[PDB]
Amino acid sequence: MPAPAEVQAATLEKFIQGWAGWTPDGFLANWSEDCTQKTLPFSSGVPLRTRADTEKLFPVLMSLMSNFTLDIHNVVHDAPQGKAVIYALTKADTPFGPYRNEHAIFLWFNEIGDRVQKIEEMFDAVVIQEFLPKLDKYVA
Amino acid sequence: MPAPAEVQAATLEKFIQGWAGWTPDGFLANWSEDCTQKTLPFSSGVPLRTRADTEKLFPVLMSLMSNFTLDIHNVVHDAPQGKAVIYALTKADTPFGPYRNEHAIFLWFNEIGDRVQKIEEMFDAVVIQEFLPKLD
Ligand SMILES: COC(=O)c1c(O)c(C)cc(O)c1C(=O)c1c(O)cccc1O
C-alpha cells in the first residue's frame, strides 16, 4: 500500500523546496538511495539516470546557472497510487545568456512516503545531453 | 468544491476512450462548452485552441493519421483538486510513413465532474506549429 496521503504531500513539498534551494545535497536528500530519473519522451532514447549519475551532473550544472528560480505552475497528487506530477518553470542566468526550461515531472513515492523513488521528466534536455558532455566529458 | 472521485474517474475514462476512438465528435463529447487546449511549454507560444478550433481542426488531422493506437503509460488522478494527468504514447500511419508522439496531458474537470474544462498538453507540436501555419 502507499504511504499516508499527508506524508506523501509533505514529501512533495520538501522535494519542491530542495529543488528551489538549488544545492546538490539539499535536493538529492529527497531522493531515495535507489531513485532513478528518466528523460521523456521515451522516443528520445535518453538513458535512465541513476542517483549516482545525477550526483555527478548537478554540481557543475547548478554552479553554471546563477540566480536560479523555480515556479510551480501545477501540482497533481494521486495519494491512492503514491504518485504525483509537477509542472514547473525554471530560469537562471548563465555566461552564455538566460536559461529557461519547463518540466512535466512525474513522481513516485517510496513506501514510507518520505522520499521520491522514481522520476520521469518531460523537459528540454539539450543542456544535459549536448552541453554538459562538451564542457565536462571531453575537457576533463 | 470538486465532484466525487468516482464521478471524476468516469469522466477521465470517457476522455481516454474518446481519444482512443479517434473521431472528432467522440473526442469532443467530453469537453465542456468553454474547454480550451493549451500546448506546453508556454515558451513555445502556441496559441490556445478553443472547442470550436478543435471541431474545425480534428477532422482533417485524424483523417491524415490512420491505424491510430493510444498507449496509456501513466494516469495520475487528484480527486481533491479535480485534476488529472495522463502520459500517453500515440502511434499512427501516414503516407509519409509511421507516426509517433507522446503527450503529458494535464486535465481539469468541471465542477459537476462530468466534463473536462481545461487541458494543458506537453507534446511534440510540430504539426500544429510548423505544418498548419505554413499551409495557410
Ligand atoms: C487529432 O489530434 C488529436 O485528436 C489530439 C488529441 O486527441 C489529443 C488528446 C492530443 C493531441 O495533441 C491531439 C493532436 O492535436 C495531435 C496528435 O494527436 C498528433 C499529432 C498532432 C496533433 O495535433
From Swiss-Prot, chain A:
Pathway: Secondary metabolite biosynthesis. InterPro entries: Fungal_Meroterpenoid_Isomerase, NTF2-like_dom_sf. Its EC number is 1.-.-.-. It comes from the Eukaryota. The keyword Oxidoreductase applies. Coiled coil: none annotated. The keyword Signal does not apply. Keywords: Monooxygenase, Oxidoreductase. GO terms for molecular function: monooxygenase activity. Gene3D superfamilies: 3.10.450.50. It is an enzyme of class 1 (oxidoreductase). Monooxygenase; part of the gene cluster that mediates the biosynthesis of the tetrahydroxanthone dimer neosartorin, which exhibits antibacterial activity. The two different monomeric units appear to be synthesized by the same set of enzymes, among which the Baeyer-Villiger monooxygenase nsrF is the key enzyme for the divergence of the biosynthetic routes. The pathway begins with the synthesis of atrochrysone thioester by the polyketide synthase nsrB. The atrochrysone carboxyl ACP thioesterase nsrC then breaks the thioester bond and releases the atrochrysone carboxylic acid from AacuL. Belongs to the avfA family. This is Monooxygenase nsrQ. It comes from Aspergillus novofumigatus (strain IBT 16806). The gene is nsrQ.
Curated annotation (Swiss-Prot), chain B:
It comes from Aspergillus novofumigatus (strain IBT 16806). Belongs to the avfA family. Coiled coil: none annotated. It is an enzyme of class 1 (oxidoreductase). Transmembrane segments: none annotated. GO terms for molecular function: monooxygenase activity. Its EC number is 1.-.-.-. It comes from the Eukaryota. Keywords: Monooxygenase, Oxidoreductase. Monooxygenase; part of the gene cluster that mediates the biosynthesis of the tetrahydroxanthone dimer neosartorin, which exhibits antibacterial activity. The two different monomeric units appear to be synthesized by the same set of enzymes, among which the Baeyer-Villiger monooxygenase nsrF is the key enzyme for the divergence of the biosynthetic routes. The pathway begins with the synthesis of atrochrysone thioester by the polyketide synthase nsrB. The atrochrysone carboxyl ACP thioesterase nsrC then breaks the thioester bond and releases the atrochrysone carboxylic acid from AacuL. The keyword Ligase does not apply. This is Monooxygenase nsrQ. Pathway: Secondary metabolite biosynthesis.
